[PDB]
Amino acid sequence: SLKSTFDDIKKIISKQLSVEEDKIQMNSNFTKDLGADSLDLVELIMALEEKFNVTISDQDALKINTVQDAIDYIEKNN
Numbered sequence: 001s002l003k004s005t006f007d008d009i010k011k012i013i014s015k016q017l018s019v020e021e022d023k024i025q026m027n028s029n030f031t032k033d034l035g036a037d038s039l040d041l042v043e044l045i046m047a048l049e050e051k052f053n054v055t056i057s058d059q060d061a062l063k064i065n066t067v068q069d070a071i072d073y074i075e076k077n078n
């Protein structure tokens, strides 16, 4: 389910960024809205890779700016 991948990703983000799940929305931008720094970003991409068993290249990661970007990436790639 969209809801299922959504719920998994929110937990990952919440834990990495110390932000309550309810504050995490599709257009939430990691750096502009959720206070992510450079190490946060590295930790998040590695956490997505570990959870969803996908490989996110450096250039892909540079295009994952929001929650929706990350969900759409995972749904594209399983």
Ligand SMILES: *OP(=O)(O)OCC(C)(C)[C@@H](O)C(=O)NCCC(=O)NCCS
Binding pocket: 037, 038, 039, 040, 042
């Ligand atoms: O603090 P920041 O978010 O800008 O950076 C965090 C990361 C992990 C991206 C870097 O600190 C990092 O480790 N970069 C590569 C490791 C090096 O030794 N780089 C050479 C100096 S730029």
